[PDB]
Design a protein around this ligand. Structure first.
Ligand SMILES: N[C@@H](CCCC[NH3+])C(=O)O
Ligand SMILES: N[C@@H](CCCC[NH3+])C(=O)O
Ligand SMILES: [Co+2]
Ligand SMILES: [Co+2]
Lengths: 347, 347
């Protein structure tokens, strides 16, 4: 299974009690996420406020590799503002939750999608359900199946943080059946019941292609799938893939940056970067206690920076230039060379 | 599904880097867990060290309601020491992990079980696999099925913290098939891939009856299923059951007690008791952002203390005496009256 991350530090993260990111803070965060290799960066909807709009505009025009995306309600005026910011993708939200008129939902959606398709044909269109896991699946599938021919991606969002891993798996398989071969599936999961990482994993197991994370899991309440924890989960299953696509050794810089900005300490037990993530009580690994004589190690700390014509000339040019650039910055490490070259040499 | 908690703060928690509990600390912890309503309290094997043995003896003879249990390797000399401490249950460990002679395992097990059955017939016998989720299931099931007629409970332990929720579910269903109607199933899960709570939940979904937790999830590395997080997960699914069986309003006292003893701060985002567990950025719940006009709430903070002959005379006697005792201590709250009386009045 292949998959991509949608970072939400500048969307979900702004809901975190202590977050108040300046435009400079956001640029710093986005540049670091881009260097890390994150594929998508979602920002708070530009219709939220003048500053949300200004920040979306700045971030979308930074020339990042990562695609800068946003979200809107199903309103033509919101769509208009979002397109104007220059974002590369727009997620349209709907809700059918028991805790909240399907024909209206579908019609308003198609109207807005039609507008975006015409005004900005290059922009990704996504369509997602707020409070997915308190909504009746037949209502969800009805809406997804109606909109799927016209969108690039559909989204499931466990807004309230109650979904169980096997519910996420089941519903993702159902959505895949209904949207067909082309349409991708994104998952956004809150952590109120301790399932955000497990749910993100199970969505991928079931065929989802995109997962939302934030650095340190910051977000509304106890937040969403944390970047570090999610990477740990995926690294144990696909280590070569994960280590190739992301600069895992910079994880501690990302955690520290955000911790400093929002004024928290990294949790004592935080995935990977927490003080005790790799340690145990000296003297307590006793043969009377454990069968295996070694203290177990799920992954190594250093991986996460913790103490006839011819073809291929374009890639050769890019690769050699990139390696040279790293060398001249004093940043050419064995980790970098591995991730740059493994796909060319090994088979 | 009904189920019980095995607290492991005095077994798994002793592996936590910063833990060094005195005998007094352990008594304080065990008394608080007993008041909270935890069913089982597991202590480090008495064969580990003179102090482990002394502490097991003290805890097992405190007259707690909770059952004090321990673990051993499959050795007659270990079994002997464990029985002598007066513990009410003994878990025998085996390992078949790919990362570590089945006939030997089974024979040594039956020898030790036989000894315990004869020497202490009242003691619960449990039988558990170290590093369960890196072991071949056919090896596991072979051992479980051979020992099950003679034990009270079998255990699965994700020692290395790599199991996925659907693996836990599948293997638990398989174990249930093999051990039959009488034998219970316990689950112990590490959190290295962020799945400890989700895995504990899925084990229960599949038929498991016991789950290990520690306060704040302290333990080796980033620890195991945390008490608070697990209770949150279960409360959202079975709120009446959970609120009846445990004094949920004392959760903050338990988290604070352990945090103080081991010298950590409660994580900013800790389940229930963390600073931001219930909060969000003031002003950021915008109608432009969320469809639902209210900021979502998975459970209420106050629930967890966060800001012809006749029959039934014996229970009437116990209930009236208990309510009177609470009143005279100044501890008779509406929460207490609810959990004491709901099972008598409602139907
Ligand atoms: N924070 C929003 C995210 C929605 C994601 C939709 N792609 C929620 O929890 O509902
Ligand atoms: N801390 C031990 C617990 C074993 C539990 C067996 N009932 C482990 O992770 O393997
Ligand atoms: Co959210
Ligand atoms: Co353990």
């Amino acid at each position: 299974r292949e998959w991509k991350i949608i970072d939400s530090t500048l969307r979900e993260g702004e809901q975190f009690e202590k977050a108040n990111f300046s435009t400079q803070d956001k640029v710093e965060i986005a540049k670091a996420l881009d260097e890390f290799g994150i594929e998508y960066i979602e920002v708070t909807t530009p219709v939220a406020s003048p500053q949300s709009r200004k920040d979306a505009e700045v971030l979308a025009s930074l020339g990042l590799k990562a695609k800068v995306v946003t979200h809107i309600q199903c309103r033509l005026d919101a769509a208009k503002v979002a397109v104007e910011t220059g974002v590369q993708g727009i997620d349209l939200l709907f809700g059918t939750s028991k805790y909240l008129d399907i024909p209206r939902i579908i019609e308003e959606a198609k109207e807005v999608i039609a507008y975006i398709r015409e005004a900005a044909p290059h922009v990704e269109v996504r369509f997602s359900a707020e409070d997915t896991f308190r909504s009746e699946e037949q209502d969800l599938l009805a809406v997804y199946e109606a909109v799927a021919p016209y969108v690039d991606r559909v989204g499931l969002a466990d807004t309230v943080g109650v979904a169980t891993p096997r519910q996420v798996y089941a519903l993702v398989r159902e959505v895949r059946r209904v949207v067909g071969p082309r349409v991708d599936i994104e998952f956004h999961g809150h952590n109120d019941t301790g399932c955000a990482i497990a749910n993100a994993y199970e969505a991928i197991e079931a065929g989802a292609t995109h997962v939302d994370t934030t650095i340190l899991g910051i977000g509304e309440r106890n937040g969403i799938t944390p970047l570090g924890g999610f990477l740990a989960r995926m690294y144990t299953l696909q280590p070569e893939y994960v280590r190739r696509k992301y600069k895992l050794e910079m994880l501690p810089e990302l955690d520290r940056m955000v911790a400093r900005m929002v004024g928290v300490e990294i949790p004592f037990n935080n995935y990977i970067t927490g003080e005790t993530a790799f340690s145990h009580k000296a003297g307590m690994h006793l043969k009377a206690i454990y069968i295996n004589p070694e203290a177990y190690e799920p992954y190594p700390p250093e991986v996460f920076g913790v103490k006839g014509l011819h073809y291929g000339e374009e890639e050769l040019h890019r690769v050699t230039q990139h390696i040279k650039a790293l060398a001249d910055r004093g940043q050419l490490t064995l980790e970098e060379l591995d991730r740059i070259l493994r796909e060319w040499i090994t088979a």
